[PDB]
């Protein structure tokens, strides 16, 4: 038989109706800069602290390992297209002499020490700033596909945020089937876990939901499995089994020989039950209702990044 196809609810054709020079990265002319403009100072995966000689400016250089030329091109073209977007890491330069990407400098506040200083107001503020980056990149036809805390740099001392590591990002094309290896296991949407390849921007919205959940409930990560099979089980224990099968049925997905039994039966849990005495100060009914609308099995019924910015949760921050 086979599975039912899917198209993105919003921003379906932004790449389709744009010139080939925008999305067609494999045949892109990369204008290489000079590595001798920059002086490597310290290693921060080959990421280096550096100084631009031509102006004494602090930068961060990423030296690219032996990967396929088309993967280097994909990341370069995406960063170039998104340069100037709110809270997207700025590509200052691309250099040779062996390829390197040069980024604006950013401090990273030590997590844990970030995780202990953060108030309810800080989370709303930083979630809003990530959402401006996601709405912007989605509107530009780009999925990030790796939204997670290690790719969200928060410079708390300066109240600053950058969405980084666009190495796994892709341009959205309706009907296209994509790799399901992408993203950290813990932030993989149900679509990636059931091997449904025709996904879209909505994946990043699931990942963002897992981010909020673990931040407000203070448990990293929120859904914790050892494989893709167990991961779906951990999500099922919270969202319930009924809404999951309603999703399988809707898209005619056929489960792996292992999914059937490990699922069992689970009711939908109210989010309030996860509030305990150490995380109480970060949670509100607004926060819980926003989380509920992001973390839905159905990728077509998840809040878009724009819809999300209109939730009462962010009212105090807008
Ligand atoms: O660890 C870092 C990684 C990156 C980075 C940024 C963009 C990419 O596509 C890949 C990696 O930028 C940074 C920028 C900084 O200012 C500081 C960092 O530690 C990093």
Coordinates of C-alpha atoms and ligand atoms in Angstrom, one line a residue:
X1 CA 0.0 0.0 0.0
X2 CA 1.5 3.4 1.1
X3 CA 1.3 6.6 3.2
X4 CA -0.8 9.7 2.6
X5 CA 1.2 12.8 1.5
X6 CA 1.4 16.1 3.3
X7 CA 2.0 19.8 2.5
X8 CA 2.9 22.7 4.8
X9 CA 0.0 24.7 6.1
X10 CA 1.9 28.0 5.7
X11 CA 4.8 29.1 3.5
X12 CA 4.2 26.2 1.2
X13 CA 5.6 27.8 -2.0
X14 CA 8.2 30.4 -0.9
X15 CA 11.1 28.5 -2.5
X16 CA 8.9 27.2 -5.4
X17 CA 8.1 30.7 -6.7
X18 CA 11.6 32.2 -6.0
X19 CA 14.4 32.2 -8.5
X20 CA 16.7 29.1 -8.7
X21 CA 19.7 31.1 -7.3
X22 CA 17.9 31.3 -4.0
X23 CA 17.3 27.7 -3.1
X24 CA 19.5 25.7 -5.5
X25 CA 22.6 25.4 -3.3
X26 CA 24.3 22.5 -5.1
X27 CA 25.0 24.7 -8.2
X28 CA 25.9 27.9 -6.2
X29 CA 29.0 30.0 -6.8
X30 CA 30.7 30.4 -3.4
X31 CA 32.7 33.6 -3.1
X32 CA 35.5 32.5 -0.8
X33 CA 37.2 35.0 1.5
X34 CA 40.7 34.9 3.1
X35 CA 41.7 33.0 6.2
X36 CA 44.6 35.4 6.7
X37 CA 42.2 38.2 7.7
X38 CA 41.6 36.3 10.9
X39 CA 43.8 35.3 13.8
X40 CA 42.9 32.1 15.8
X41 CA 43.3 32.7 19.5
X42 CA 41.7 29.6 21.2
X43 CA 39.6 26.5 20.6
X44 CA 36.1 26.8 22.1
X45 CA 33.7 19.9 15.9
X46 CA 36.3 22.6 15.2
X47 CA 35.1 26.0 16.6
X48 CA 37.7 28.7 17.3
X49 CA 37.7 32.0 19.1
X50 CA 39.3 34.6 16.8
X51 CA 40.1 38.2 16.0
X52 CA 39.6 39.9 12.6
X53 CA 42.9 41.7 11.9
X54 CA 41.2 44.3 9.6
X55 CA 39.3 45.9 12.5
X56 CA 40.2 44.2 15.8
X57 CA 36.7 42.7 16.0
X58 CA 36.0 39.5 18.0
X59 CA 34.6 36.6 15.9
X60 CA 34.0 32.9 16.1
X61 CA 35.4 30.7 13.3
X62 CA 34.0 27.3 12.5
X63 CA 36.5 25.2 10.5
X64 CA 34.6 22.6 8.4
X65 CA 35.6 19.0 8.7
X66 CA 35.9 16.8 5.6
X67 CA 32.2 16.7 4.6
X68 CA 30.5 16.7 1.1
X69 CA 30.8 19.9 -0.8
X70 CA 27.0 20.0 -1.1
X71 CA 26.6 20.1 2.7
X72 CA 29.0 23.0 3.0
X73 CA 27.1 24.8 0.2
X74 CA 23.7 24.1 1.8
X75 CA 24.9 25.7 5.1
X76 CA 26.6 28.6 3.4
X77 CA 23.6 29.5 1.2
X78 CA 21.1 29.2 4.2
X79 CA 23.2 31.5 6.4
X80 CA 23.6 34.0 3.6
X81 CA 19.9 34.0 2.9
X82 CA 19.0 34.5 6.6
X83 CA 21.7 37.1 7.4
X84 CA 19.9 40.0 9.1
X85 CA 17.0 37.9 10.4
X86 CA 16.2 38.6 14.1
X87 CA 18.2 36.4 16.4
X88 CA 19.8 34.4 13.6
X89 CA 23.6 34.0 13.9
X90 CA 25.3 36.4 11.6
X91 CA 27.7 35.0 9.0
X92 CA 30.4 37.7 8.9
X93 CA 32.5 35.8 6.3
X94 CA 33.3 32.6 4.5
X95 CA 37.1 31.8 4.0
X96 CA 39.6 29.5 2.4
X97 CA 43.3 28.8 3.2
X98 CA 40.0 24.1 3.4
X99 CA 36.8 26.0 4.3
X100 CA 35.8 28.0 7.4
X101 CA 32.7 29.9 8.4
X102 CA 33.2 33.2 10.3
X103 CA 30.4 34.3 12.7
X104 CA 29.7 37.3 14.9
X105 CA 31.0 36.8 18.4
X106 CA 28.6 35.7 21.2
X107 CA 29.1 34.9 24.9
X108 CA 27.4 31.8 26.2
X109 CA 26.1 32.0 29.7
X110 CA 27.1 28.8 31.5
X111 CA 23.9 26.7 31.6
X112 CA 22.8 25.4 35.1
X113 CA 24.0 28.9 36.2
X114 CA 21.7 30.1 33.5
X115 CA 19.1 27.5 34.6
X116 CA 19.3 28.8 38.3
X117 CA 19.1 32.5 37.5
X118 CA 16.2 32.3 35.0
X119 CA 12.8 33.6 36.1
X120 CA 9.4 33.1 34.5
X121 CA 9.8 36.5 32.7
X122 CA 13.2 35.5 31.3
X123 CA 11.8 32.3 29.7
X124 CA 8.9 34.1 28.1
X125 CA 11.4 36.7 26.7
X126 CA 13.8 34.1 25.3
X127 CA 11.1 31.9 23.9
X128 CA 9.7 35.0 22.1
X129 CA 13.2 35.8 20.6
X130 CA 13.5 32.2 19.3
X131 CA 10.0 32.5 17.8
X132 CA 11.1 35.6 15.8
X133 CA 13.9 33.6 14.3
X134 CA 11.6 30.6 13.5
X135 CA 8.9 32.7 11.9
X136 CA 11.5 34.5 9.9
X137 CA 13.4 31.5 8.6
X138 CA 10.2 29.5 7.9
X139 CA 8.9 32.5 5.9
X140 CA 12.2 32.3 4.0
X141 CA 11.5 28.6 3.1
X142 CA 14.0 27.2 5.6
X143 CA 13.6 24.4 8.2
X144 CA 16.2 24.4 11.0
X145 CA 15.6 20.7 11.9
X146 CA 17.9 20.9 15.0
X147 CA 16.2 23.2 17.5
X148 CA 17.6 22.3 21.0
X149 CA 19.3 24.1 23.9
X150 CA 22.8 23.4 22.6
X151 CA 21.8 25.3 19.4
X152 CA 20.2 28.2 21.2
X153 CA 22.9 30.5 22.6
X154 CA 21.6 32.7 25.4
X155 CA 23.9 35.5 26.5
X156 CA 21.9 36.4 29.7
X157 CA 24.3 39.1 30.9
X158 CA 23.4 41.0 27.7
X159 CA 19.9 39.7 27.3
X160 CA 20.8 38.3 23.8
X161 CA 19.9 35.2 21.8
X162 CA 21.1 33.6 18.6
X163 CA 19.8 30.5 16.8
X164 CA 23.0 28.7 15.8
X165 CA 24.2 25.6 14.0
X166 CA 22.4 25.7 10.7
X167 CA 24.4 22.7 9.4
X168 CA 21.3 20.4 9.4
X169 CA 18.9 23.0 7.9
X170 CA 17.1 22.5 4.6
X171 CA 14.9 24.4 2.1
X172 CA 11.2 23.3 2.1
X173 CA 9.7 21.9 -1.1
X174 CA 6.1 20.6 -1.2
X175 CA 6.0 16.9 -1.8
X176 CA 9.7 16.4 -1.0
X177 CA 10.8 13.5 1.3
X178 CA 13.4 14.4 3.9
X179 CA 15.9 12.5 6.1
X180 CA 14.6 11.5 9.5
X181 CA 18.0 11.2 11.2
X182 CA 18.2 15.0 11.8
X183 CA 17.7 16.5 15.2
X184 CA 18.5 15.2 18.7
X185 CA 16.5 12.1 19.6
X186 CA 14.9 14.0 22.5
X187 CA 13.6 16.8 20.2
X188 CA 12.5 14.6 17.3
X189 CA 8.8 15.1 16.4
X190 CA 6.5 12.1 16.1
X191 CA 6.7 12.4 12.3
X192 CA 10.5 11.6 12.4
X193 CA 9.9 8.8 14.9
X194 CA 7.3 7.0 12.7
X195 CA 9.5 7.4 9.6
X196 CA 7.1 9.9 8.0
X197 CA 9.4 11.7 5.6
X198 CA 7.1 14.4 4.1
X199 CA 7.5 16.8 7.0
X200 CA 7.8 20.6 7.2
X201 CA 8.5 23.7 9.4
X202 CA 6.2 22.3 12.1
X203 CA 9.0 20.0 13.2
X204 CA 10.8 23.0 14.7
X205 CA 7.7 23.8 16.6
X206 CA 7.7 20.4 18.2
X207 CA 11.3 20.8 19.1
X208 CA 10.6 24.2 20.6
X209 CA 7.8 22.6 22.7
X210 CA 10.2 20.1 24.1
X211 CA 12.5 23.0 24.9
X212 CA 9.9 24.9 26.8
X213 CA 8.7 21.8 28.7
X214 CA 12.2 21.0 29.9
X215 CA 12.9 24.7 30.8
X216 CA 9.7 25.4 32.8
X217 CA 9.5 21.9 34.4
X218 CA 13.3 21.9 34.9
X219 CA 14.1 18.4 33.5
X220 CA 16.6 17.9 30.7
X221 CA 15.4 16.5 28.5
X222 CA 11.6 16.3 29.0
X223 CA 11.0 13.2 26.9
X224 CA 13.9 10.8 27.4
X225 CA 14.2 7.6 25.3
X226 CA 17.1 5.3 24.4
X227 CA 15.8 4.7 20.8
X228 CA 13.2 6.1 18.4
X229 CA 10.8 3.4 19.6
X230 CA 11.0 4.3 23.3
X231 CA 11.0 8.0 22.5
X232 CA 7.5 7.7 21.1
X233 CA 6.5 5.7 24.2
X234 CA 7.7 8.5 26.5
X235 CA 5.7 11.1 24.5
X236 CA 2.7 8.7 24.6
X237 CA 2.9 8.5 28.4
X238 CA 2.2 12.2 28.5
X239 CA 0.1 13.0 25.4
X240 CA -1.8 9.7 25.5
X241 CA -2.3 6.9 23.0
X242 CA -5.6 7.8 21.5
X243 CA -4.5 11.1 19.9
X244 CA -1.4 9.1 18.6
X245 CA -3.5 6.5 16.7
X246 CA -5.8 9.2 15.4
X247 CA -2.6 10.6 13.8
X248 CA -1.4 7.2 12.4
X249 CA -4.9 6.7 10.9
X250 CA -5.0 10.2 9.3
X251 CA -1.7 9.7 7.4
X252 CA -2.0 5.9 6.9
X253 CA 1.3 5.2 8.6
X254 CA 2.3 1.6 9.2
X255 CA 4.1 1.0 12.5
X256 CA 7.4 -0.8 12.8
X257 CA 7.3 -4.4 14.2
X258 CA 8.2 -3.0 17.6
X259 CA 5.8 0.0 18.0
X260 CA 2.7 -2.1 18.3
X261 CA 3.3 -3.6 21.8
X262 CA 5.5 -1.0 23.5
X263 CA 2.7 1.5 23.2
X264 CA 0.2 -0.1 25.5
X265 CA -2.5 2.3 26.6
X266 CA -2.2 5.8 28.1
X267 CA -4.6 8.7 28.8
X268 CA -3.8 12.3 28.1
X269 CA -2.2 13.8 31.1
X270 CA -2.9 17.4 32.3
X271 CA 0.3 19.4 32.3
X272 CA -0.3 20.6 35.9
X273 CA 0.7 17.3 37.3
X274 CA 4.3 17.9 36.4
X275 CA 4.5 21.0 38.6
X276 CA 6.5 20.3 41.7
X277 CA 8.2 22.4 44.5
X278 CA 11.4 23.1 42.6
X279 CA 9.9 24.3 39.3
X280 CA 6.7 26.0 40.5
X281 CA 8.0 29.6 40.0
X282 CA 8.4 29.1 36.2
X283 CA 4.9 27.7 35.5
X284 CA 1.6 29.4 34.9
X285 CA -1.7 28.4 33.3
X286 CA -0.7 30.6 30.3
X287 CA 2.6 28.6 30.0
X288 CA 0.7 25.2 30.2
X289 CA -1.9 26.1 27.6
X290 CA 0.8 27.3 25.2
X291 CA 2.8 24.1 25.7
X292 CA -0.3 22.0 25.0
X293 CA -0.9 23.8 21.7
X294 CA 2.7 23.3 20.6
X295 CA 3.1 19.6 21.6
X296 CA 0.5 17.9 19.4
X297 CA 1.1 14.6 17.5
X298 CA -0.4 16.1 14.4
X299 CA 2.2 18.3 12.7
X300 CA -0.6 20.1 10.7
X301 CA -2.3 21.2 13.9
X302 CA 0.7 22.6 15.8
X303 CA 0.9 26.3 16.4
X304 CA 2.8 28.2 13.7
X305 CA 5.6 30.4 15.0
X306 CA 3.5 33.5 14.2
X307 CA 0.4 32.0 15.9
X308 CA 2.6 31.2 18.9
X309 CA 3.7 34.9 19.4
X310 CA 0.1 35.9 19.8
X311 CA -0.5 33.6 22.8
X312 CA -1.3 35.3 26.2
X313 CA 1.9 33.7 27.5
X314 CA 3.9 36.3 25.8
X315 CA 1.6 39.3 26.5
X316 CA 4.0 40.8 29.1
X317 CA 7.0 40.6 26.7
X318 CA 5.6 41.9 23.4
Ligands
LIG1 O1 29.8 27.1 19.6 C1 29.5 28.0 18.7 C2 28.9 27.5 17.5 C3 28.5 28.4 16.5 C4 28.0 28.0 15.3 C5 27.2 29.0 14.7 C6 26.6 28.7 13.5 C7 26.8 27.5 12.9 O2 26.1 27.2 11.7 C8 27.5 26.5 13.5 C9 28.1 26.8 14.7 O3 28.6 29.8 16.7 C10 29.1 30.2 17.9 C11 29.2 31.6 18.1 C12 29.7 32.1 19.3 O4 29.7 33.4 19.4 C13 30.1 31.3 20.3 C14 30.1 29.9 20.1 O5 30.5 29.1 21.2 C15 29.6 29.3 18.9

